[PDB]
Amino acid sequence: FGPFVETPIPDVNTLALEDIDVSNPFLYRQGQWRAYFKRLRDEAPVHYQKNSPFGPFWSVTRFEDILFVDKSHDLFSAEPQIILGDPPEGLSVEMFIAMDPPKHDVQRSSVQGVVAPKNLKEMEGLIRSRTGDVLDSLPTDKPFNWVPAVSKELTGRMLATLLDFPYEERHKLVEWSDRMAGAASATGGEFADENAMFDDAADMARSFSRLWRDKEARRAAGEEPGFDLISLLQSNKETKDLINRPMEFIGNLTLLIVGGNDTTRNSMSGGLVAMNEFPREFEKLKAKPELIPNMVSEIIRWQTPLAYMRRIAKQDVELGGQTIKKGDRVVMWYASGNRDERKFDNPDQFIIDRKDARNHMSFGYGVHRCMGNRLAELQLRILWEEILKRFDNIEVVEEPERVQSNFARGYSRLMVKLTPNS
Ligand code: HEM
């Protein structure tokens, strides 16, 4: 009903404050995002942009203010979408990441068992084995792209395990997720073909339905239930009939794959980029390997794989000396908050023994705090544990290529030369 090409981004000092548009999906790639958000934090921490390709929106850029917006779901709704823009027509799917309580609470309870700490503990052998195997497969006499060989490879195996997806088809979960999460209308991503998105959403719905029916058929034949989400959903009375609720069914399954896809991937890659910019931290790590758990938090803080989550004001809200109007879109820029010097001293430095590194907001805060935070930290810890066993040095031999997006902060190309230890 009713009615992106890259260009050089100018110095933020050349702009009136009302003309700063941080929805530009090239701000991260071009390294301008730090100066743009710092100007916002300093002089417009609750900022209204009237004109953007996504329409008007508020930017909330200070750590303390983002906490308030994220935790106050009675003032700022997560519905109906948490990306800055809109999904293409015909591709809206309800996910509980874009739902307020109580309904958010009910839907998250039906899937949260898949990351139960007892289950993650039991899967450590498999994760570490996969993490050992891919690392042993990497060449040490020539450089290679770390993104497909390591980050995406380990991420895709993990996603397959989570759903018991056919392993040989796991590349499909990632390709579908990338196209869906990289919609030009939603995040300024490079996917602008609505035809391919319609084909993906149909292949994906058909694939999840086949997986559901194959699993119930295997369970009816006596196969013991497992750790995966489908086994868990078919073991609980509330969700044993979830296929008869297609919106809930597709919504929960797509959220799990999109939630863990480029987040895990870009956190695996981003640690190497941070180490490259701050090489003394790798010597500190080698001499004190017990720093790995805290370093994982510092990698996640420094990388902030998801730059923001978006809300809609449910009423007029006074915040930062401004009046957010009912209905306005409000963007909580985690990428800015994690660089806020009011919260972190020396915020742009990668400091692996930073004592308050675990207080980052890359997972958000409030009822929507990332459900897979422990799963992500676990894979990242194991990754660096297995790196230290094998490699005395790691070299980035080319400027990393960063992904076009205002939402995902990640890398498509990371060329790495490995040096084994003695
Ligand atoms: C470093 C890794 C990760 C980061 C930075 C990250 C980031 C986030 C963020 C920012 C949110 C929303 C927070 C908010 O609105 O307050 C979120 C929620 C969510 N994430 Fe993650 N994520 C990561 C890993 C994962 C993984 C591995 C999975 C799946 C296994 C996952 C699945 C989800 C789900 C299902 C939600 C919805 C939670 C809810 O609405 O209650 N995430 N994540």
Measured from the Cβ of residue 50, the count of other Cβ atoms closer than 10 Å reads: 10
Pair of tokens at residue 224: 């013991």
Residue of the CA atom closest to atom 16 of ligand 1 = 364
Q: Give the β-pairing of 76-77 and 309-313.
A: antiparallel
Query: What is the separation, in whole angstroms, between the first and last Cα of the chain?
Result: 67
The response to whether 171 counts as a known ligand-binding position is no
Q: For 19, how many CA atoms within 13 A lie in the half-sphere containing its CB?
A: 8
Spatial separation of the C-alpha atoms in residues 264 and 296, rounded to whole Å = 12
Residues composing the chain:
422
Task: List the resolution, Å.
Answer: 2.1
User: Residue 261 belongs to what H/E stretch?
Assistant: helix 246-277
Atom of ligand 1 nearest to the CA of 300: 1
Ramachandran assignment for 70, one of left (phi > 0), alpha (psi -120 to 50 degrees), beta (any other): alpha
Spatial separation of the C-alpha atoms in residues 98 and 367, rounded to whole Å = 11
Among 370, 375, 378, 406, the mutation site with the greatest number of ligand 1 atoms within 8 A of its Cβ is: 370
Spatial separation of the C-alpha atoms in residues 376 and 366, rounded to whole Å = 18
The response to whether 108 counts as a known ligand-binding position is yes
CA of 244 to the centre of ligand 1 (A): 26
CA of 162 to the centre of ligand 1 (A): 15
Pair of tokens at residue 110: 């039906």
Spatial separation of the C-alpha atoms in residues 27 and 82, rounded to whole Å = 20
Measured at the CA of 319, the angle between CA 314 and CA 321, to 5 degrees, comes to 140
Residue of the CA atom closest to atom 37 of ligand 1 = 97
According to the entry, how was the structure determined? X-ray
| Strand intervals (E) in 86-184 | 144-145
Spatial separation of the C-alpha atoms in residues 176 and 163, rounded to whole Å = 15
Q: What is the DSSP string of 121-142?
A: HHTHHHHHHHHHHHHHHS-SSS
Spatial separation of the C-alpha atoms in residues 156 and 260, rounded to whole Å = 9
- 391 forms beta bridges with 420
Residue of the CA atom closest to atom 19 of ligand 1 = 370
CA of 303 to the centre of ligand 1 (A): 14
CB 61 within 8 A of CB 35: no
Q: Give the β-pairing of 322-324 and 317-319.
A: antiparallel
Among 154, 163, 263, 382, the mutation site with the greatest number of ligand 1 atoms within 8 A of its Cβ is: 263
CA of 407 to the centre of ligand 1 (A): 13
